[PDB]
């Protein structure tokens, strides 16, 4: 919401914006609110689940997203050697 | 790397794996390398371009990816920061 994030021409680049909308836990409603509360990927992944719950307004979306952010490429690949 | 990372099913869950591969600056060679240096999205977005150049071995890929990680959804659109 700073001078750099406020788009004059207002195109909305379908790279990073769309990048959100394809993530589990994201809808356009909470994407736009997100978009105002986060910079991009870095800060999005830096945000806690609780922050996402505040932005998205649902712990469902927040958990889905937060979990997707933390799910290692080689995590779910295992079935549960260390049973949690 | 530990027993943690060792895939039982060796499925390689496509979701986050492919999530990398679609990012500008990511190729399978540097993705696999990344995959060994990065947990998931959070660590990727936490890593600096220095780290990316080390992992990917290319400054080109590192710069492309670093840019993508740190460019707000509307930042490319914002003519206040860049462009003419």
From Swiss-Prot, chains A, B:
Tree of life domain: Eukaryota
Signal peptide start and end residues: none
Impact when changing residue 79 to Q: Mimics acetylation; promoting interaction with ERCC1
Cellular localisation: Nucleus; Chromosome
Disease affiliated with this protein: Xeroderma pigmentosum complementation group F: An autosomal recessive pigmentary skin disorder characterized by solar hypersensitivity of the skin, high predisposition for developing cancers on areas exposed to sunlight and, in some cases, neurological abnormalities. The skin develops marked freckling and other pigmentation abnormalities. XP-F patients show a mild phenotype. XFE progeroid syndrome: A syndrome characterized by aged bird-like facies, lack of subcutaneous fat, dwarfism, cachexia and microcephaly. Additional features include sun-sensitivity from birth, learning disabilities, hearing loss, and visual impairment.
Subunit structure: Heterodimer composed of ERCC1 and ERCC4/XPF. Interacts with SLX4/BTBD12; this interaction is direct and links the ERCC1-ERCC4/XPF complex to SLX4, which may coordinate the action of the structure-specific endonuclease during DNA repair.
Function description: Catalytic component of a structure-specific DNA repair endonuclease responsible for the 5-prime incision during DNA repair, and which is essential for nucleotide excision repair (NER) and interstrand cross-link (ICL) repair.
Family label: Belongs to the XPF family.
UniProt-recorded name of the protein: DNA repair endonuclease XPF
Organism encoding this protein: Homo sapiens (Human)
Full-sequence range covered: 834 to 916 of 916
């Amino acid at each position: 919401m700073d001078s750099e994030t406020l788009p004059e021409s207002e195109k909305y680049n379908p790279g990073p914006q769309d990048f959100l909308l394809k993530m589990p836990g994201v809808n356009a409603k909470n994407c736009r609110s997100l978009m105002h509360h986060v910079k991009n990927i870095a800060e999005l992944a830096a945000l806690s689940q609780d922050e996402l719950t505040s932005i998205l307004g649902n712990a469902a979306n927040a958990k889905q997203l937060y979990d997707f952010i933390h799910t290692s490429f080689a995590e779910v690949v295992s079935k549960g050697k260390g049973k949690k």
